[PDB]
Design an enzyme around this catalytic site. Structure first.
Site, PDB file in Angstrom:
ATOM      1  N   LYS C  86       1.050  -1.715   0.096  1.00 22.73           N
ATOM      2  CA  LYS C  86      -0.018  -0.105   0.053  1.00 22.73           C
ATOM      3  C   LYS C  86       0.548   1.408  -0.456  1.00 22.73           C
ATOM      4  O   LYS C  86       0.679   2.379  -0.485  1.00 22.73           O
ATOM      5  CB  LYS C  86      -0.915  -0.028   1.527  1.00 22.73           C
ATOM      6  CG  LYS C  86      -1.781  -1.548   1.371  1.00 22.73           C
ATOM      7  CD  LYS C  86      -2.916  -1.234   0.188  1.00 22.73           C
ATOM      8  CE  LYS C  86      -4.094  -1.861   0.488  1.00 22.73           C
ATOM      9  NZ  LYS C  86      -5.484  -1.883  -0.606  1.00 22.73           N
ATOM     10  N   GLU C 108      -9.859   6.462   3.190  1.00 25.52           N
ATOM     11  CA  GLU C 108     -10.172   5.048   3.944  1.00 25.52           C
ATOM     12  C   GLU C 108      -9.589   3.960   4.019  1.00 25.52           C
ATOM     13  O   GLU C 108      -8.856   3.457   3.569  1.00 25.52           O
ATOM     14  CB  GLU C 108     -11.841   4.684   2.694  1.00 25.52           C
ATOM     15  CG  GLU C 108     -11.295   3.049   1.751  1.00 25.52           C
ATOM     16  CD  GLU C 108     -10.104   4.245   0.866  1.00 25.52           C
ATOM     17  OE1 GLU C 108     -10.244   5.407  -0.230  1.00 25.52           O
ATOM     18  OE2 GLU C 108      -9.796   3.435   0.443  1.00 25.52           O
ATOM     19  N   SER C 376       1.708  -9.582  -0.576  1.00 24.29           N
ATOM     20  CA  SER C 376       2.000  -8.180  -0.126  1.00 24.29           C
ATOM     21  C   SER C 376       1.866  -7.568   0.454  1.00 24.29           C
ATOM     22  O   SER C 376       2.003  -6.278   0.636  1.00 24.29           O
ATOM     23  CB  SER C 376       0.044  -8.373  -0.736  1.00 24.29           C
ATOM     24  OG  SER C 376      -0.650  -9.104  -0.408  1.00 24.29           O
TER      25      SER C 376
HETATM   26  C1  LIG Z   1      -1.875  -6.512   3.213  1.00 25.15           C
HETATM   27  C2  LIG Z   1      -2.282  -6.134   2.181  1.00 25.15           C
HETATM   28  N1  LIG Z   1      -3.056  -7.508   0.872  1.00 25.15           N
HETATM   29  C3  LIG Z   1      -4.307  -7.425  -0.057  1.00 25.15           C
HETATM   30  C4  LIG Z   1      -4.554  -6.267  -0.314  1.00 25.15           C
HETATM   31  C5  LIG Z   1      -6.253  -6.029  -0.809  1.00 25.15           C
HETATM   32  O1  LIG Z   1      -5.651  -4.987  -1.435  1.00 25.15           O
HETATM   33  P1  LIG Z   1      -5.708  -4.432  -2.474  1.00 25.15           P
HETATM   34  O2  LIG Z   1      -6.478  -5.836  -4.035  1.00 25.15           O
HETATM   35  O3  LIG Z   1      -4.416  -5.337  -3.243  1.00 25.15           O
HETATM   36  O4  LIG Z   1      -6.201  -3.094  -3.318  1.00 25.15           O
HETATM   37  C6  LIG Z   1      -5.410  -5.561   0.904  1.00 25.15           C
HETATM   38  C7  LIG Z   1      -6.668  -5.049   0.797  1.00 25.15           C
HETATM   39  N2  LIG Z   1      -6.069  -3.840   2.336  1.00 25.15           N
HETATM   40  C8  LIG Z   1      -7.390  -2.677   2.968  1.00 25.15           C
HETATM   41  C9  LIG Z   1      -8.564  -3.509   2.398  1.00 25.15           C
HETATM   42  O5  LIG Z   1      -9.625  -3.809   4.217  1.00 25.15           O
HETATM   43  C10 LIG Z   1      -6.709  -1.667   4.020  1.00 25.15           C
HETATM   44  O6  LIG Z   1      -6.122  -1.974   4.326  1.00 25.15           O
HETATM   45  O7  LIG Z   1      -7.504  -0.541   3.731  1.00 25.15           O
HETATM   46  C11 LIG Z   1      -4.146  -5.548   2.096  1.00 25.15           C
HETATM   47  O8  LIG Z   1      -3.594  -4.946   3.284  1.00 25.15           O
END
Ligand SMILES: Cc1ncc(COP(=O)(O)O)c(/C=N/[C@@H](CO)C(=O)O)c1O
Ligand SMILES: Cc1ncc(COP(=O)(O)O)c(/C=N/[C@@H](CO)C(=O)O)c1O
Ligand SMILES: O=P(O)(O)OCCNS(=O)(=O)c1ccc(OC(F)(F)F)cc1
Ligand SMILES: O=P(O)(O)OCCNS(=O)(=O)c1ccc(OC(F)(F)F)cc1
Ligand SMILES: [Cl-]
Ligand SMILES: [Cl-]
Ligand SMILES: [Cl-]
Ligand SMILES: [Cl-]
Ligand SMILES: [Cl-]
Ligand SMILES: [Cl-]
Ligand SMILES: [Cl-]
Ligand SMILES: [Cl-]
Ligand SMILES: [Cl-]
Ligand SMILES: [Cl-]
Ligand SMILES: [Cl-]
Ligand SMILES: [Cl-]
Ligand SMILES: [Cl-]
Ligand SMILES: [Cl-]
Ligand SMILES: [Cl-]
Ligand SMILES: [Cl-]
Ligand SMILES: [Cl-]
Ligand SMILES: [Cl-]
Ligand SMILES: [Cl-]
Ligand SMILES: [Cl-]
Ligand SMILES: [Cl-]
Ligand SMILES: [Cl-]
Ligand SMILES: [Cl-]
Ligand SMILES: [Cl-]
Ligand SMILES: [Cl-]
Ligand SMILES: [Cl-]
Ligand SMILES: [Cs+]
Ligand SMILES: [Cs+]
Ligand SMILES: [Cs+]
Ligand SMILES: [Cs+]
Lengths: 268, 394, 394, 268
Positions: C86, C108, C376
């Site tokens: 992120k 958000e 991720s």
């Molecule tokens: C460590 C990790 N991997 C994947 C994802 C999945 O998000 P994408 O598909 O990559 O955009 C998230 C998502 N988190 C958001 C929603 O709750 C949030 O923090 O607000 C995450 O924290």
């Protein structure tokens, strides 16, 4: 150190091995510890190995860990231990008294001053458990200046240089380690030590006492038969203390019984 | 007989039971051999780069020094896999264990960071790992204990003595004294008997080496000082080593002052303890007047080693390095400041180093100085501790 | 009127109240401008390298694939500052906010990872940050909420609707519709109205670009497939983008299957929902038969976005990318496996991607395949959740 | 859409602005909502704006957020809303009825089918809150096919292209947004809108109704004086519902009082 020479000469004449118990000074309290030690002597101990309670006894298994904890629970300090040692010597003129120390207690108020206090109270030897021969110089020098025998460990993993060093530097007795690991009656030494015993004799070492895991008469006899001058027993003695905390009188009776049996096994 | 000098001046040595001397000698030989072995070095470099994420960033912190003549960089060991610098030397030690044909790992831990690092490396490299941790620490560090177990390590609570790090240290050495033919003891700091102070420094020295290259690239000169917290001494000596011969570069180690030196509740043996002999070395100790070993107190779990590595005591003695202390409250202020002004959450250990740098800046704001703080770990693990303090306050 | 196509095929668009159209147009212009600006690019690169720690490692995982013909690498976004991918696009968006002369940030968050990243970047770059988070999520994510507040962000619980992420999404857009002259809305995924899907992809695409360079260096060829979990779509599209034109390279997105697709308790709208129009886009939605928006269920907090970015729906439609699902139990098994065999603790989100790679390997163990999983995030945050499940089990 | 043309021509003749309340259909329940709507009409409402409860009303402030929540608590569905709309038209032949929709409810079962249902029940206009003119084509086409007026938003941030588009594409009325932000009586529009009103007239737009933050008679009169054809009030009406949930009879009395006052202010 002269007390050891005299003992060994006398035992040679009585064709006996030495039986040497270990206890922690002040376990489970000062008064009981003094009674314990007098019982060991009366029951046939040839010499004593005595531990000063230390915070971090890293060569000791749980039995002796707990003995140190009991003594601390009783508020036992090194100064109180030296008071005890003076009284023990005042009671018993010829028995060799060896201390089991950790380095920090020896170094704390100066190495020389430590050995001078040992000489003042009538100690005969000091084994510093966490000082290998490699580090031993200031300790063995101070010991000898104060007529204290420096006790060296001959481990079963000993090479020829080590045997020669321990033979040269040591006095009193040579500590023949039964095995690797830490003190404890629950682990018996599974190694023939005859070759080490023979080499130590070849190099005119102080007579060998086997120690670690000695808990039974057959082990005392085995030590003597292999050519050792005797055997040391610690955890087995301390377990009798631990077993009998609730009953001081029974504690002494069982200690007497055990030491008597172990001493009888030293007859060749 | 050893290959290398076991002492730094009067400090250090090999104060272990005789039974352990062959294990230390074996380890020393394996290390000296490994350091000449290109294959070993290549495998180590591969793990550091591709598994741990080296090199780590050197971050310039503009906001926190605004309006002063201090330029402050943070060496980002918080970004290393595992979230602390401990990973570096664990990988090297695990490779030495393999080099020696050992198949098992023993480790001590207080805060749990070294334990986690030991567990992760053991999992990667196929070693069976057992970790000793004082029973009090096990209770305080449920997350780290769980991480260790998830990674397949055996965590063994130690109930003897004070049931904390020193007691874990003892238990590791008791185990090793009986298992050294198959097991390696993966000591977690630059302390203990030779050869550990030397091995741990050499396996952490990439911190300072990278820092030197990074600062030369960004600033065209060496730092005026490099600043690191000192628990047992590993992150600090890893930052300091490559700069020791650069005599213009200040080396500042920061011990925990706890509730304040005068209270006695601190962890600053180098400047406020007394030399003793314990955990295989001659070094400054927290100890009673009688010579019983005492614990280090700090708000930060990882600054709990009650002594200090012998090379630090030596560098102090000769005046090459200077050692200071930072109290719990100072460390907490530095923690909050970095979070709010730089968007980095530092480990409370590391926060002690940052606190001293902030003091250097704030006390003399018109002094031109280029400083690097070693940010030894991330502070995710500390937000509960901080939460609870700030709750009990404002 | 826009500079760029707001649609990917039939999917995407700008379904916002008229009042917000100038803000989207402004953002689009600022982005198109920024992408041509070497100064902007240099500042972004500096932050990614020296603050966030890019490039991230690509780790080869030897143990987990032993005895099969799968070679598996993990792209280590878990090692980025903040512990998730992120951070990448937050830094870019914060720079766009500055480019536009905006001084405030709205974000958000569901799991809290995007919120923490937004808070950290805002702290670094001097922006005032307000984060909306569904009241249910605030309760579930006390650590992340505290991290956000430590970093000086205002966290605003949202009590409307289902009090979860979609409701936070609404509140962010209501706030923006009244504050856009001074505030930028830092949307946290590759979804929402144009230009967000495009901006978020471009500010995450270094994931795939680095992966391509790393795999070419290590293996001399492109991967057979790259695999990423899909919540809203940002980490996946950041991994996929640079490979889209490499038609030999499979692109596999993994949605959360929750308790199982057949249960209805999942978060897999791309393959098991229904196209709708909401949160500014035309895209597959979790929704009732009547067209009310529903929540995504997953064991993993971060796979809670109840729709999916429009580029994923498009890449699916044309058959360029394939999308699958992984259940809670599969993800939990992958989590445990990586911990024990590779010494890496993965985020439960990321564990969904790893689970699908393990399935690819296990189902066809004699198939030669070179796979990359996008890791991720780190899973430190998930050890309580895992603890509680494994406690309720064995 | 013809109902709006007829209304505006009649109001022009009575030299009056239009007063148009908004409520959420089925807030606080179906039966009470029908009574509420009949009270608004009886009290002088010239036209109605009616919301279908939606999960995610992102153009609405808390007052109307809560109205949607109340209707959901009552189990209100879009199908029930269309039943309500049919009955309202069966009661009241000439009053213009406009819906306030979100896109997903329109798109859900097909855009064309949505507008066909609106035509079947006698709705006159549809405002889709999250569809800007840029996205409006399939919506406005379906609307016009089914004789429904597509209602476009003229924001205060409107440029000339937007004014021309809204003037061309819209029918029924042009929604003149008082201000940025979301619905709510707590925020009053602090922008003169006369210029927009004049430009819309220049471009032959559908007559303008001002909406957002209209909560007082002086605002109705101000809208008319600026050249608007009238004014819409939502949150102020819904707050009376919210204030009086515990007292249905008092709710209607207060609604009547409020609407009567607001309608009286529309007299030029
Ligand atoms: C460590 C990790 N991997 C994947 C994802 C999945 O998000 P994408 O598909 O990559 O955009 C998230 C998502 N988190 C958001 C929603 O709750 C949030 O923090 O607000 C995450 O924290
Ligand atoms: C993040 C961090 N920074 C600094 C230090 C301090 O250790 P050095 O002085 O760098 O060796 C530690 C220590 N932790 C040990 C002891 O509890 C352990 O985990 O077991 C740490 O975790
Ligand atoms: O019978 P056990 O197994 O309890 O052994 C008795 C031990 N008591 S001791 O004082 O001889 C003794 C001797 C040596 C020790 O450590 C060292 F070898 F490292 F030096 C520790 C204790
Ligand atoms: O009096 P207030 O402030 O509650 O405003 C009343 C609002 N009710 S409405 O149906 O006209 C209405 C009109 C437009 C809306 O959103 C949009 F502009 F984005 F399209 C939302 C509601
Ligand atoms: Cl003394
Ligand atoms: Cl001799
Ligand atoms: Cl017996
Ligand atoms: Cl040497
Ligand atoms: Cl020396
Ligand atoms: Cl062994
Ligand atoms: Cl470098
Ligand atoms: Cl160089
Ligand atoms: Cl330069
Ligand atoms: Cl000093
Ligand atoms: Cl502590
Ligand atoms: Cl100073
Ligand atoms: Cl300086
Ligand atoms: Cl275009
Ligand atoms: Cl289109
Ligand atoms: Cl605004
Ligand atoms: Cl690269
Ligand atoms: Cl290239
Ligand atoms: Cl290659
Ligand atoms: Cl489909
Ligand atoms: Cl969820
Ligand atoms: Cl498959
Ligand atoms: Cl393939
Ligand atoms: Cl419908
Ligand atoms: Cl018209
Ligand atoms: Cl009134
Ligand atoms: Cs500065
Ligand atoms: Cs220290
Ligand atoms: Cs393989
Ligand atoms: Cs999804």
């Amino acid at each position: 150190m002269e007390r050891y020479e005299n003992l060994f000469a006398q035992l040679n004449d009585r064709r006996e091995g030495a039986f040497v118990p270990f206890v922690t000074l002040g376990d489970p309290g000062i008064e009981q510890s003094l009674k314990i030690i007098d019982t060991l002597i009366d029951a046939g101990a040839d010499a004593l190995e005595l531990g000063v309670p230390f915070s971090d006894p890293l060569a000791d298994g749980p039995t002796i860990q707990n003995a140190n904890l009991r003594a601390f629970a009783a508020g036992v300090t090194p100064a109180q231990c030296f008071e005890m040692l003076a009284l023990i010597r005042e009671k018993h003129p010829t028995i060799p008294i060896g201390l089991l120390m950790y380095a920090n207690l020896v170094f704390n108020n100066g190495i020389d001053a430590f050995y001078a206090r040992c000489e003042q109270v009538g100690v005969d030897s000091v084994l510093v458990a966490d000082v290998p021969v490699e580090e031993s110089a200031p300790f063995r020098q101070a010991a000898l200046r104060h007529n204290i025998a420096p006790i060296f460990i001959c481990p079963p993993n000993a090479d020829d240089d080590l045997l020669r060093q321990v033979a040269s530097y040591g006095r009193g007795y040579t500590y023949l380690l039964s095995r690797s690991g830490v003190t404890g009656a629950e682990n018996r030494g599974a190694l023939p030590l005859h070759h080490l015993i023979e080499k130590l004799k070849e190099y005119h070492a102080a007579p060998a006492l086997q120690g670690f895991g000695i808990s039974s008469p057959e082990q005392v006899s085995a030590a003597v038969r292999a050519g050792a001058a005797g055997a040391i027993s610690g955890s087995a003695i301390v377990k009798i203390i631990e077993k009998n905390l609730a009953s001081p009188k029974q504690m002494l009776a069982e200690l007497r019984s055990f030491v008597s049996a172990m001493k009888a096994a030293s007859r060749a | 007989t050893t290959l290398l000098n076991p002492y730094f001046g009067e400090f250090g040595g090999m104060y272990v039971p005789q039974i352990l001397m062959p294990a230390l000698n074996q380890l020393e030989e394996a290390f000296v051999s490994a350091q000449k072995d290109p294959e070993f070095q290549a495998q180590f470099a591969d793990l550091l780069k591709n598994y741990a994420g080296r090199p780590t960033a050197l971050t310039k912190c503009q906001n926190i020094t605004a309006g002063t003549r201090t330029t402050l960089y943070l060496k980002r060991e918080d970004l290393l896999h595992g979230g602390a610098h401990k990973t570096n030397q664990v990988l090297g030690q695990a490779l030495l264990a393999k080099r020696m044909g050992k198949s098992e790992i023993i480790a001590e831990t207080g805060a749990g960071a070294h334990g986690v690092a030991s567990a992760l490396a053991s999992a990667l490299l196929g070693l069976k790992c057992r970790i000793y941790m004082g029973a009090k620490d096990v209770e305080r560090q449920s997350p780290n204990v769980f991480r260790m177990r998830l990674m397949g390590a055996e965590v063994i609570p130690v109930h003897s003595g004070s049931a904390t790090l020193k007691d874990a240290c003892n238990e590791a050495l008791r185990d090793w004294s009986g298992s050294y033919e198959t097991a390696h003891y993966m000591l977690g700091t630059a302390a203990g008997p030779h050869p550990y102070p030397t091995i741990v420094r050499e396996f952490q020295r990439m911190i300072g080496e990278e820092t030197k290259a990074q600062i030369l690239d960004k600033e065209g000169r060496l730092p005026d000082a490099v600043i690191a917290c000192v628990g047992g001494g590993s992150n600090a000596i890893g930052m300091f080593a490559d700069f020791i011969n650069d005599t213009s570069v200040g080396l500042i180690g920061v011990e925990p002052g706890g509730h304040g030196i005068e209270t006695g509740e601190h962890g600053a043996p180098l400047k406020h303890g007394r030399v003793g002999i314990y955990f295989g070395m001659k070094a400054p100790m927290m100890q009673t007047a009688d010579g019983q070993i005492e614990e280090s107190y700090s708000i930060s779990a990882g600054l709990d080693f009650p002594s200090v590595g012998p090379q630090h005591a030596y560098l102090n003695s000769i005046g090459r390095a200077d050692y200071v202390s930072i109290t719990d409250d100072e460390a907490l202020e530095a923690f909050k400041t970095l979070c709010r002004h730089e968007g980095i959450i530092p480990a409370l250990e590391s926060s002690h180093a940052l606190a001293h740098a902030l003091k250097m800046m704030r006390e003399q704001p018109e002094k031109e100085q280029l400083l690097v703080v070693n940010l030894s770990g991330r502070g995710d693990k500390d937000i509960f501790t901080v939460h609870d303090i700030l709750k009990a306050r404002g």
